[PDB]
Amino acid sequence: IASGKVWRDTDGNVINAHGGGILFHEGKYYWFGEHRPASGFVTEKGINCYSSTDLYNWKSEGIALAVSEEEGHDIEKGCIMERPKVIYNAKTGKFVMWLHLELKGQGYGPARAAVAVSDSPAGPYRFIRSGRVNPGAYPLNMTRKERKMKWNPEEYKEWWTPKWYEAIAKGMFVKRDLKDGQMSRDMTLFVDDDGKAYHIYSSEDNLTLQIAELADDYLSHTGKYIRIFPGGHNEAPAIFKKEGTYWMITSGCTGWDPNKARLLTADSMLGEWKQLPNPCVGEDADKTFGGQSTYILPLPEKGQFFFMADMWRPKSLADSRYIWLPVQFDDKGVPFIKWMDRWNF
Numbered sequence: 001i002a003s004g005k006v007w008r009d010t011d012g013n014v015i016n017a018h019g020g021g022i023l024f025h026e027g028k029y030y031w032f033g034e035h036r037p038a039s040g041f042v043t044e045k046g047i048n049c050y051s052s053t054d055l056y057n058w059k060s061e062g063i064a065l066a067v068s069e070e071e072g073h074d075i076e077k078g079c080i081m082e083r084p085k086v087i088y089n090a091k092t093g094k095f096v097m098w099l100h101l102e103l104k105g106q107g108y109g110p111a112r113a114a115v116a117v118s119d120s121p122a123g124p125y126r127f128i129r130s131g132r133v134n135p136g137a138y139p140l141n142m143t144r145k146e147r148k149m150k151w152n153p154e155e156y157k158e159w160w161t162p163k164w165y166e167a168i169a170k171g172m173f174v175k176r177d178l179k180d181g182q183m184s185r186d187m188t189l190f191v192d193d194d195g196k197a198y199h200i201y202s203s204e205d206n207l208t209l210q211i212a213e214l215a216d217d218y219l220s221h222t223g224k225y226i227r228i229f230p231g232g233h234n235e236a237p238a239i240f241k242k243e244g245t246y247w248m249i250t251s252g253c254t255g256w257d258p259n260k261a262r263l264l265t266a267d268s269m270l271g272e273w274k275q276l277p278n279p280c281v282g283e284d285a286d287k288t289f290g291g292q293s294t295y296i297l298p299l300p301e302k303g304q305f306f307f308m309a310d311m312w313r314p315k316s317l318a319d320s321r322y323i324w325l326p327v328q329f330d331d332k333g334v335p336f337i338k339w340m341d342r343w344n345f
């Protein structure tokens with residue numbers, strides 16, 4: 001595992017799986033990610049999939065979720081498809097893919113999460129629906145008093161004033177988006193011990209993280225959700241659970257530029273969360289080693305976890321590389337990550 005180098009599949013082609021994540025099923029790891037083009041930023045293809053027995057040799061499984069050729073479809077060619085994650089639904093036996101969708105020709109405005117389904121890990125997946133999250137429902141931890149407040153859009157046009165920040169903290173953008181549902185851009189998924197799944201996403205114009213419970217088949221949301229770190233600008237969330245504790249690594253919001261990772265922790269997924277120091281340590285840790293969090297893969301057979309990131313090259317996004325590093329734990333059980341040029345499982 002040689003972070004930042006050109007990685008190739010078994011045919012010799014550059015692995016094209018960005019913003020991704022990995023699952024294990026029937027003896028194989030399946031890596032899902034954005035198919036990025038050589039020029040431009042929008043996918044020409046959809047969500048790509050690769051498979052491996054060993055986490056070193058990756059076989060191209062082809063496109064798992066394709067862009068549609070039908071005009072007016074939510075996922076017609078030219079839509080934005082980012083940060084795909086796949087989870088297995090044990091009750092129905094289906095593979096469920098969620099992803100950040102922006103409708104074609106609308107930039108990043110729609111701020112939707114989309115959901116697709118497959119009988120097999122590699123696909124093809126069948127698109128079901130897209131939309132903002134939980135129309136009509138308030139966050140669980142947004143208080144009665146906060147829900148009763150009125151925010152005149154004309155008084156709060158200037159971002160980053162003291163009164164605007166306070167307003168964002170007390171849920172001004174939640175109320176703004178209440179009817180049509182909460183915004184979802186950068187996102188991930190987590191399947192808990194009891195089969196409860198959660199959709200974690202940057203919401204409220206990227207200012208605030210939200211964690212939403214998924215329904216029992218993982219195809220919709222239940223209405224139950226919380227919001228955390230309002231105004232915190234936590235992006236590209238990555239999550240894992242260890243010995244009952246939930247840990248989340250995120251980035252800041254500086255477009256393509258690498259920035260300082262944050263470490264967030266809770267004892268309950270929908271309980272209170274708190275922020276801990278940058279979990280990256282050593283030289284370049286202030287820049288997350290030139291990367292941005294995408295996924296934390298548990299290896300539950302070994303009681304270990306590994307941190308996946310993207311080393312984004314905005315000049316040509318197909319040339320973006322992959323940083324994969326062991327998650328280590330200090331004497332208090334707090335995760336940290338150090339660079340290694342080459343390491344083995």
Ligand SMILES: OC[C@H]1NC[C@H](O)[C@@H](O)[C@H]1O
Nearest residue numbers: 019082186235236255256
């Ligand atoms: O918009 C480009 C880029 N910005 C930063 C996000 O974390 C990425 O997923 C991607 O949307």
Ligand SMILES: [Ca+2]
Nearest residue numbers: 207208209234
């Ligand atoms: Ca955020």
